[PDB]
Amino acid sequence: SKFSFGQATPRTLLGIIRLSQALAKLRLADMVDIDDVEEALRLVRVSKESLYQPTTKIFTIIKKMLQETGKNTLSYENIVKTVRLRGFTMLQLSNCIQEYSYLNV
Amino acid sequence: RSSILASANPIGSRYNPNLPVTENIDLPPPLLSRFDLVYLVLDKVDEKNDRELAKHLTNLYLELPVEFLTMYISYAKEHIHPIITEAAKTELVRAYVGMRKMGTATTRQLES
């Protein structure tokens, strides 16, 4: 993409290790956890940053089902269940289906 | 009289498959023909081998043996003197002929 800094090598892997060991060793810690491993990964990512200076929420589930089963029916049983499980009220779903009935779906 | 082990970086920064193999190596053919083995070590991005490599590296920084190996090596160099058999002779001939027929197959590779 002409966008990277020259790829990431296995040296980057040991880069994470040494930074995590160094960060933990600064706080006198004898063990290293995610709070510093993520910080080590943060430094090898922040350095490159200077170069770079609800109807859809319902319809996405329908589209996912149209990929899983693809049945273009008018009556629905899986959509109503999953949308209800997602926390919506069926009035919102009814309006969502009504709009897409007009919107070429 | 000695053995040479050499490591060479690719021309430029990284290996480029667009250029031929001889253009990624900064050695003239007369020198390049002498080496018995040239290993093209290429770095892929396949996780099916990257993850296994990662495990092998990561399992080593928490908390046959060399004595057997050197004892084995020192014994073989001292007592073993193999002789090429008649049957094995033909294979060397055919392998070089086939390798030559694809036309850098100098005779220095045949003694290799």
Curated annotation (Swiss-Prot), chain A:
It is found in: Cytoplasm; Nucleus. ATP 2 binds at R11. It comes from the Eukaryota. Acts as a component of the MCM2-7 complex (MCM complex) which is the putative replicative helicase essential for 'once per cell cycle' DNA replication initiation and elongation in eukaryotic cells. Core component of CDC45-MCM-GINS (CMG) helicase, the molecular machine that unwinds template DNA during replication, and around which the replisome is built. Component of the MCM2-7 complex. The complex forms a toroidal hexameric ring with the proposed subunit order MCM2-MCM6-MCM4-MCM7-MCM3-MCM5; loaded onto DNA, forms a head-head double hexamer. Interacts with CSM1 and MCM10. Present with 166 molecules/cell in log phase SD medium. Early fractionation of eukaryotic MCM proteins yielded a variety of dimeric, trimeric and tetrameric complexes with unclear biological significance. Specifically a MCM467 subcomplex is shown to have in vitro helicase activity which is inhibited by the MCM2 subunit. The MCM2-7 hexamer is the proposed physiological active complex. Belongs to the MCM family. This is DNA replication licensing factor MCM7. It comes from Saccharomyces cerevisiae (strain ATCC 204508 / S288c) (Baker's yeast). The chain holds residues 677 to 791 of 845 of the full protein.
Curated annotation (Swiss-Prot), chain B:
Coiled coil: none annotated. A motif (Arginine finger) lies at residues 33-36. It is found in: Nucleus. Acts as a component of the MCM2-7 complex (MCM complex) which is the putative replicative helicase essential for 'once per cell cycle' DNA replication initiation and elongation in eukaryotic cells. The active ATPase sites in the MCM2-7 ring are formed through the interaction surfaces of two neighboring subunits such that a critical structure of a conserved arginine finger motif is provided in trans relative to the ATP-binding site of the Walker A box of the adjacent subunit. The six ATPase active sites, however, are likely to contribute differentially to the complex helicase activity. Component of the MCM2-7 complex. The complex forms a toroidal hexameric ring with the proposed subunit order MCM2-MCM6-MCM4-MCM7-MCM3-MCM5; loaded onto DNA, forms a head-head double hexamer. Belongs to the MCM family. Present with 8800 molecules/cell in log phase SD medium. Early fractionation of eukaryotic MCM proteins yielded a variety of dimeric, trimeric and tetrameric complexes with unclear biological significance. Specifically a MCM467 subcomplex is shown to have in vitro helicase activity which is inhibited by the MCM2 subunit. The MCM2-7 hexamer is the proposed physiological active complex. This is DNA replication licensing factor MCM4. It comes from Saccharomyces cerevisiae (strain ATCC 204508 / S288c) (Baker's yeast). The chain holds residues 668 to 800 of 933 of the full protein.
